[PDB]
Design a protein around this ligand. Structure first.
Ligand code: SF4
Ligand code: F3S
Ligand SMILES: [Cl-]
Ligand SMILES: [Cl-]
Ligand SMILES: [Mg+2]
Lengths: 265, 601
């Protein structure tokens, strides 16, 4: 048998679901058909309404304590929770219900991990990350907006092979993917080290791939696999394509000033 | 009961609730009433999420806005970024260089293809295709069907289809059905023969593997997909042909060659897999008489117009827009996003508040103050709704109207507009016109003849305003977008080879150069229809930022006059095989490709 995954969606943009299906190794097709049993997921599931909701009770009973809850997005606490409604009820009620009997909880992306864009000031819905609502269950955070596809499927692959959550850092992120800052192995680092910087878009320095620090790159303070694993089967990453890192895997990155203001010190 | 827009609404029949609506982006609730014969006579569209991006943007730097609003949606990823940089550039009188224009067009058209094809296969197909029936298909007859439907598709052998079928069999026989669990399989609403079901499921799997390749075009120009990077004033992906090692640029000839390889693959997929499947499935549902779902497409359609073959020259739009009213395709009205009397949003039946909710606000004057409150006729409580009260406020989606009229937006709207423009003598719309005429001939004659079915005589006026037509237009648009970006690539490479390597205009990058106040608008023909962002800038900061998004139009609740939007109109007058199985509701709603995070932002 394949481990059931119940994939819930709160307030989100669905980028994490989209990133997941970009995975080349393993293919999302192979994950769905051969690795997990993806039993509930709003994006892809055949059943709707009453038939969809009926799946949750069935899996939770049959696989009690032996399914994975994956959460994309987050619950809002304002508007009596009804700024995110599922089955006529607040999302937070669904989240708490499904979480109770999960063997592990994955917080996909910056939304579920920390709050992401809807939690940026002044956070009109009081969007709240999963670990602040679910406080009695093991939660692995997989932050990024979205996370890299192979990071997402890498987490799943580890969990299914070993029936364990991988080693986490103090912020709950898997060390196997989030141990390095972008700036550690960024290919533009030799330019940084020599004080060779882009100062205006499309200047001579930009055309030579000089460091993007002075254009606001937040690589020096951001932990992710982007510089090495890179994006979309290692095709590029933000810096390689010419834009500084905006810090998208870090808690509260929307409220750390303009993306184009350089780090100080 | 009341009459509006030629629809007789009646809520006296049996009430049916679908919550969640699945196989969409985001959160939606739908309620209908059905008559004694299971025909929908009332429909209610409820957007069940809100995040408040418009509120969040206040006070921030206009140059950062694109990244915030990009996160309105990861499905239509980047179209909001494009709208945002266009809005800021419009406010600040910035003109981007030719290479930036072309790269943005290529990214936009890549999104169109990816979004459309993934929608059809992974979200929509299961409304037309019975996966369990695919298990009964004969592999040789499936091979024979494939050769008739698309002679050029090389994946067609009986052995190939047998292998796919076997994997599906083993999956089902495991007792863990996953995404197929509790499905509506076997419903009489499904009409395809087993062989068509197996072909379609095979392509569902093919498309799932292939879609990840197409987006590598975004990755090259924008660093990542989802959520590629954009830039006020141009693109960040600087160009250098000679540059190697320490002097390597984001874009060189090898990167451009890679992009062309991806574009060529896209063209093959659209022509060999996607368009033929939709033509075939459309033909078979047409033969079954399933022409429901036209809604507002039969009268009122709108798009801002897009893809000028000369930058900043709207007369050259390759998907020319405007507005059609009353089903009069002989008259296209111009649409001006700047005109306070044209695009307006009501909140009469939405969970927001205005000073005066009898008026619609143009987005430069837009207001987003939440007001979650339920009507007196609600069944249930504020936090446990059993039946929503559509006489009061019933959605997180605002109600956009054009000169007070309720409009349908989307690929179908663009294709009806293109057809109308071509008939008036617009040469820029020749290709979509050609696609439409070809498609009608395939659906009416060629495919029926090939399948031994009777030949039909539907006009485009009859075929297009339907759920089938809406699905067709999306597929044709995907094909047209692949063709266009193939040309854009050639123009980009030729321009660079002629010596123009510029990718960004930075003259007005620094806010010390800006006017102390300004307003701007950016529009985009996004995958689901007409997208606009309206910005007001004051002393370097965002004063107001309002988005009116395609699914805001289509999914909108009723306005002050009680006029219904495109989703609600489309469901009207549709029979259901079983009122407790929402097959027909899903098929028609899905034909709009609802993006609920987009609709509410
Ligand atoms: S581009 Fe960013 S991450 Fe790379 S070396 Fe410069 S500052 Fe560090
Ligand atoms: S913006 Fe995000 S995708 Fe990587 S390069 Fe920076 S952590
Ligand atoms: Cl965050
Ligand atoms: Cl209330
Ligand atoms: Mg809006």
């Amino acid at each position: 048998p394949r481990t059931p995954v119940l994939w819930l969606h709160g307030l989100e943009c669905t980028c994490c679901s989209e990133s997941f299906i970009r995975s080349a190794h393993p293919l999302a097709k192979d994950v769905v058909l051969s690795m997990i049993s993806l039993d509930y997921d709003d994006t892809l599931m055949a059943a709707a309404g009453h038939q969809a909701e009926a799946i949750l009770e069935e899996i939770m009973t049959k696989y009690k304590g032996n399914y994975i809850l994956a959460v994309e997005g987050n619950p809002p606490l304002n508007q009596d929770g009804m700024s995110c409604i599922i089955g006529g009820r607040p999302f937070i009620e669904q989240l708490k219900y499904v979480a109770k009997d999960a063997k592990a909880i994955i917080s996909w992306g910056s939304c579920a991990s920390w709050g992401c864009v809807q939690a940026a000031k002044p956070n009109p819905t009081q969007a709240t990350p999963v670990h602040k609502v679910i406080t009695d269950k093991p939660i692995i955070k997989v932050p990024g907006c979205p996370p890299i596809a192979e990071v997402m499927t890498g987490v799943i692959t580890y969990m299914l092979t070993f029936d364990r959550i991988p080693e986490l850092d103090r912020q709950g992120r898997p060390k196997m993917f989030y141990s390095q800052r972008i700036h550690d192995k960024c290919y533009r680092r030799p330019h940084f080290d020599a004080g060779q910087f882009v100062e205006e878009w499309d200047d001579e320095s930009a055309r030579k791939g000089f460091c993007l620090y002075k254009m606001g790159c937040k690589g020096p303070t951001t932990y992710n696999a982007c510089s090495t694993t890179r994006w979309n089967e290692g095709t590029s990453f933000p810096i390689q394509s010419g834009h500084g890192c905006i810090g998208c895997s870090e808690d509260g990155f929307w409220d750390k000033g303009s993306f184009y203001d350089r780090l100080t010190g | 009961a009341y009459a509006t827009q030629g629809f007789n609404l009646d809520d006296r029949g049996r009430r049916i609730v679908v919550d969640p609506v699945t196989r969409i982006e985001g959160h939606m609730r739908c309620e209908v009433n059905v008559d004694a014969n299971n025909v929908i006579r009332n429909a209610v569209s409820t957007g069940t999420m809100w995040r408040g991006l418009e509120v969040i943007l206040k006070g921030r730097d206009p140059r950062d806005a694109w990244a915030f609003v990009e996160r309105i949606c990861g499905v239509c990823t980047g179209c909001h970024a494009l709208a945002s940089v266009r809005a800021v550039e419009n406010a600040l009188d910035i003109r981007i260089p030719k290479n930036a224009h072309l790269i943005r067009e290529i990214m936009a058209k890549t999104l169109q293809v990816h979004d459309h094809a993934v929608h059809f296969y992974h979200l929509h197909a299961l409304d037309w295709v019975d996966v369990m029936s695919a298990l009964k298909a004969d592999p040789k007859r499936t091979s024979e069907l494939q050769q008739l439907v698309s002679p050029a598709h090389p994946l067609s052998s009986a052995g190939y289809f047998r292998d796919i079928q076997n994997r599906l069999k083993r999956f089902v026989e495991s007792g863990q059905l996953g995404p197929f669990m509790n499905g509506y399989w076997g419903s009489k609403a499904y009409v395809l023969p087993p062989e068509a079901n197996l072909m379609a499921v095979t392509h569902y799997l093919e498309a799932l593997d292939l879609q990840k390749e197409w987006v590598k075009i975004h990755t090259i120009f924008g660093g990542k997909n989802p959520h590629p990077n954009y830039l006020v004033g141009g693109v960040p992906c600087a160009i250098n042909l000679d540059g190697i090692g320490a002097a390597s640029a984001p874009v060189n000839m090898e990167r451009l060659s890679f992009v062309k390889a991806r574009i060529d693959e896209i063209i093959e997929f659209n022509k060999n897999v996607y368009v033929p499947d939709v033509l075939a499935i459309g033909t078979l549902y047409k033969q079954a008489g399933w022409l429901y779902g036209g809604g507002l497409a039969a009268t009122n359609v709108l798009d801002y117009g897009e893809y000028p073959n000369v930058a900043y020259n709207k007369s050259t739009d390759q998907l020319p827009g405007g507005a059609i009213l009353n089903g009069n395709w002989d008259e296209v009205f111009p649409v001006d996003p700047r005109d306070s009397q044209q695009v307006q949003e009501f909140v009469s039946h939405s969970w927001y508040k205005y000073a005066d909710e009898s008026v619609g606000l143009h987005p430069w004057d837009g207001v987003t103050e939440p007001n979650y409150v339920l009507g007196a006729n609600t069944k249930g409580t504020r936090t446990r709704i059993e039946q929503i009260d559509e006489s009061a406020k019933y959605s997180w989606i605002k109600s956009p109207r054009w000169r007070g009229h309720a409009m349908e937006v989307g690929p179908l709207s663009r294709y009806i507009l293109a057809y109308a423009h071509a008939r008036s003598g617009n040469k820029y719309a020749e290709r979509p016109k050609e696609q439409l005429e070809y498609s009608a001939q395939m659906i009416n004659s060629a495919i029926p003849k090939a399948l031994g079915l009777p030949e039909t005589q539907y006009t485009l006026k009859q075929l297009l305003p339907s759920t089938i037509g809406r699905t067709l237009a999306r597929a044709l648009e995907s094909q047209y977008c692949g063709e266009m970006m193939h040309s854009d690539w050639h123009d980009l490479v030729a321009n660079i080879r002629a010596g123009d390597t510029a990718t960004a205009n930075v003259d007005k990058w620094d806010p010390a150069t800006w006017p102390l106040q300004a307003k701007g608008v950016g529009t985009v023909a996004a995958p689901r229809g007409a997208l606009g962002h309206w910005i007001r800038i004051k002393d370097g900061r965002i004063e107001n930022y309002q988005c009116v998004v395609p699914t805001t139009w289509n999914g909108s609740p009723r306005d002050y006059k009680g006029q219904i939007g495109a989703f609600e109109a489309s469901l009207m007058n549709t029979p259901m095989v079983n009122p407790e199985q929402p097959v027909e509701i899903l098929r028609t709603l899905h034909s709009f490709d609802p993006c609920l995070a987009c609709s509410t932002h």
